[PDB]
Design an enzyme around this catalytic site. Structure first.
Site, PDB file in Angstrom:
ATOM      1  N   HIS A  82       0.812  -1.213   0.000  1.00 40.06           N
ATOM      2  CA  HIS A  82       0.000   0.000   0.000  1.00 40.06           C
ATOM      3  C   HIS A  82       0.850   1.269   0.000  1.00 40.06           C
ATOM      4  O   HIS A  82       0.687   2.153   0.841  1.00 40.06           O
ATOM      5  CB  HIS A  82      -1.041  -0.029   1.127  1.00 40.06           C
ATOM      6  CG  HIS A  82      -2.170  -0.986   0.879  1.00 40.06           C
ATOM      7  ND1 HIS A  82      -2.222  -2.207   1.507  1.00 40.06           N
ATOM      8  CD2 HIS A  82      -3.242  -0.867   0.062  1.00 40.06           C
ATOM      9  CE1 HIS A  82      -3.318  -2.802   1.063  1.00 40.06           C
ATOM     10  NE2 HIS A  82      -3.989  -2.010   0.218  1.00 40.06           N
ATOM     11  N   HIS A  86       1.007   1.514  -5.711  1.00 39.92           N
ATOM     12  CA  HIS A  86      -0.301   0.874  -5.785  1.00 39.92           C
ATOM     13  C   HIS A  86      -1.352   1.837  -6.331  1.00 39.92           C
ATOM     14  O   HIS A  86      -2.131   1.460  -7.208  1.00 39.92           O
ATOM     15  CB  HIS A  86      -0.742   0.362  -4.397  1.00 39.92           C
ATOM     16  CG  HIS A  86      -2.193   0.006  -4.340  1.00 39.92           C
ATOM     17  ND1 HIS A  86      -2.716  -1.024  -5.099  1.00 39.92           N
ATOM     18  CD2 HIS A  86      -3.184   0.557  -3.597  1.00 39.92           C
ATOM     19  CE1 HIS A  86      -3.999  -1.101  -4.761  1.00 39.92           C
ATOM     20  NE2 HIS A  86      -4.339  -0.124  -3.904  1.00 39.92           N
ATOM     21  N   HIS A 122      -7.308   6.997  -2.753  1.00 42.75           N
ATOM     22  CA  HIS A 122      -8.092   5.947  -2.133  1.00 42.75           C
ATOM     23  C   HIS A 122      -7.415   5.176  -1.000  1.00 42.75           C
ATOM     24  O   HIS A 122      -8.125   4.494  -0.272  1.00 42.75           O
ATOM     25  CB  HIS A 122      -8.703   4.989  -3.168  1.00 42.75           C
ATOM     26  CG  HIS A 122      -7.857   3.814  -3.505  1.00 42.75           C
ATOM     27  ND1 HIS A 122      -6.867   3.897  -4.448  1.00 42.75           N
ATOM     28  CD2 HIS A 122      -7.872   2.563  -2.988  1.00 42.75           C
ATOM     29  CE1 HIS A 122      -6.334   2.677  -4.514  1.00 42.75           C
ATOM     30  NE2 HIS A 122      -6.911   1.848  -3.655  1.00 42.75           N
ATOM     31  N   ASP A 123      -6.077   5.265  -0.854  1.00 41.44           N
ATOM     32  CA  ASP A 123      -5.386   4.572   0.226  1.00 41.44           C
ATOM     33  C   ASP A 123      -4.465   5.501   1.004  1.00 41.44           C
ATOM     34  O   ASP A 123      -3.531   5.008   1.633  1.00 41.44           O
ATOM     35  CB  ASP A 123      -4.596   3.342  -0.321  1.00 41.44           C
ATOM     36  CG  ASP A 123      -5.447   2.095  -0.505  1.00 41.44           C
ATOM     37  OD1 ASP A 123      -6.309   1.832   0.362  1.00 41.44           O
ATOM     38  OD2 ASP A 123      -5.145   1.298  -1.431  1.00 41.44           O
ATOM     39  N   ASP A 236      -8.888  -1.832  -7.659  1.00 39.27           N
ATOM     40  CA  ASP A 236      -8.283  -2.327  -6.417  1.00 39.27           C
ATOM     41  C   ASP A 236      -7.940  -3.810  -6.465  1.00 39.27           C
ATOM     42  O   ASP A 236      -6.921  -4.211  -5.898  1.00 39.27           O
ATOM     43  CB  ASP A 236      -9.196  -2.038  -5.238  1.00 39.27           C
ATOM     44  CG  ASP A 236      -8.552  -1.251  -4.122  1.00 39.27           C
ATOM     45  OD1 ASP A 236      -7.294  -1.089  -4.149  1.00 39.27           O
ATOM     46  OD2 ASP A 236      -9.271  -0.905  -3.174  1.00 39.27           O
TER      47      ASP A 236
END
Ligand SMILES: COc1ccc(C2=NN(C3CCCCCC3)C(=O)[C@@H]3CC=CC[C@H]23)cc1OCCN1CCNC1=O
Ligand SMILES: [Mg+2]
Ligand SMILES: [Zn+2]
Length: 329
Positions: A82, A86, A122-123, A236
């Site tokens: 992560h 990514h 998103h992360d 994802d």
């Protein structure tokens, strides 16, 4: 605010002989063929997005887009899976689903821009630990999640940081939008990020498939939002849809990250699921087959068959890699 030296190190990178829009684009090779992989990763997202013409259409200047990518990059940590690579990968992959898979026909141009931006946030600030870890250890983010009534520990955290980045006009990629458009951009981004919690995988998947039992309505808000959630989710879980050398490298990275969580759980005296056990050992091939059989293969087959005919290659490559992992055994 970003340094001028930091912006120049990214701005100066171009890809005339390596197509960043291709389904076969190899991010591992792009990282390995430079001495500045984080600058190349940021330039991939920057050139992909400027190349599309999307930011320009929504009044997002080149400098704002670059400031935004670098502010995102600053919030990604040095973890095995992560990390910033990514999200750049998810951004690039979603771009292929939209413009090679023809899913752009199912969304407005604004929603396509929002999705590509969302892939980058998103992360944010992932520490290589899943939602369960924060709850089992009673870590501050877990306590916060429990007390506020939000079970998606990390996904809400990712939304908070996305909103923070966008609160600075110099990195507000939605700064060129107004009224309903600006509201759609923030709302869609937040719903997409919240849709990435895998504890809700079957919930989002079956909610999409049921709305698609009656003819897809591109005029409908819920229909397009569900398509956006499904595409964010698809990016994802897209590592299994790539060429084998690539899919294998993603599997190695996720394994190492999961094992580090398992070692931290062992040190803290909390429950360790077999998937996260470093000392005990499972074949990489077995892990990927399980992931494909119970998660990836039904997801892509179902979304392709219900509406996304142009994404049929995702189903084919998943089977190709699944049969390759079977051979590795
Ligand atoms: C490249 O391979 C993988 C890439 C991403 C993931 C994700 N899993 N999940 C869960 C894990 C629990 C079990 C099923 C549900 C999915 C997550 O919430 C992650 C964060 C968000 C999306 C998918 C991510 C998993 C993979 O391999 C799994 C097989 N395993 C695990 C160890 N090695 C291996 O091959
Ligand atoms: Mg996540
Ligand atoms: Zn992710």
């Amino acid at each position: 605010a970003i340094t001028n030296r930091e912006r120049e190190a990214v701005l100066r990178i171009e890809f005339p002989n390596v197509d960043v829009t291709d389904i076969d684009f190899d991010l591992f090779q792009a990282r390995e063929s430079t001495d500045k992989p984080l600058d190349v990763a940021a330039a991939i997202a920057y050139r992909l997005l400027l190349g599309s013409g999307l930011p320009q259409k929504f009044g997002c200047s080149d400098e704002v887009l670059l400031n935004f990518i670098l502010q995102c990059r600053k919030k990604y940590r040095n973890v095995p899976y992560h990390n910033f690579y990514h999200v750049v990968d998810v951004c690039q992959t979603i771009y292929t689903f939209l413009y090679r898979g023809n899913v752009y026909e199912k969304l407005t141009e604004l929603e396509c821009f929002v999705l590509l931006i969302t892939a980058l946030v998103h992360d944010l600030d992932h520490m290589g630990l899943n939602n369960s870890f924060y709850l089992k250890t009673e870590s501050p983010l877990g306590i916060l999640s429990s007390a506020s009534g939000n079970k998606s520990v990390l996904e809400v955290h990712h939304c908070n940081l996305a909103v923070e980045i966008l609160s600075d006009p110099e990195s507000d990629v939605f700064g060129g939008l107004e009224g309903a458009e600006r509201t759609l951009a923030f709302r869609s981004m937040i719903d997409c990020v919240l849709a990435t919690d895998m504890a809700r995988h079957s919930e989002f998947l079956e909610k999409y498939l049921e709305l698609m039992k009656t003819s897809y309505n591109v005029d409908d808000s819920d229909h397009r939002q569900m398509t956006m959630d499904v595409l964010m989710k698809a990016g994802d879980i897209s590592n299994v849809t790539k060429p084998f050398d690539i899919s294998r490298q993603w599997a190695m990275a996720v394994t190492e990250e999961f094992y580090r969580q398992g070692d931290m759980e062992k040190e803290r005296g909390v429950e360790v699921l077999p998937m996260f056990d470093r000392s005990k050992n499972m074949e990489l091939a077995k892990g990927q087959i399980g992931f494909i059989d119970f998660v990836a293969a039904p997801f892509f087959q179902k979304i392709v068959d219900a509406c996304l005919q142009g994404m049929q290659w995702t189903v084919d490559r998943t089977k190709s890699n699944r049969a390759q992992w079977e051979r590795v055994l």
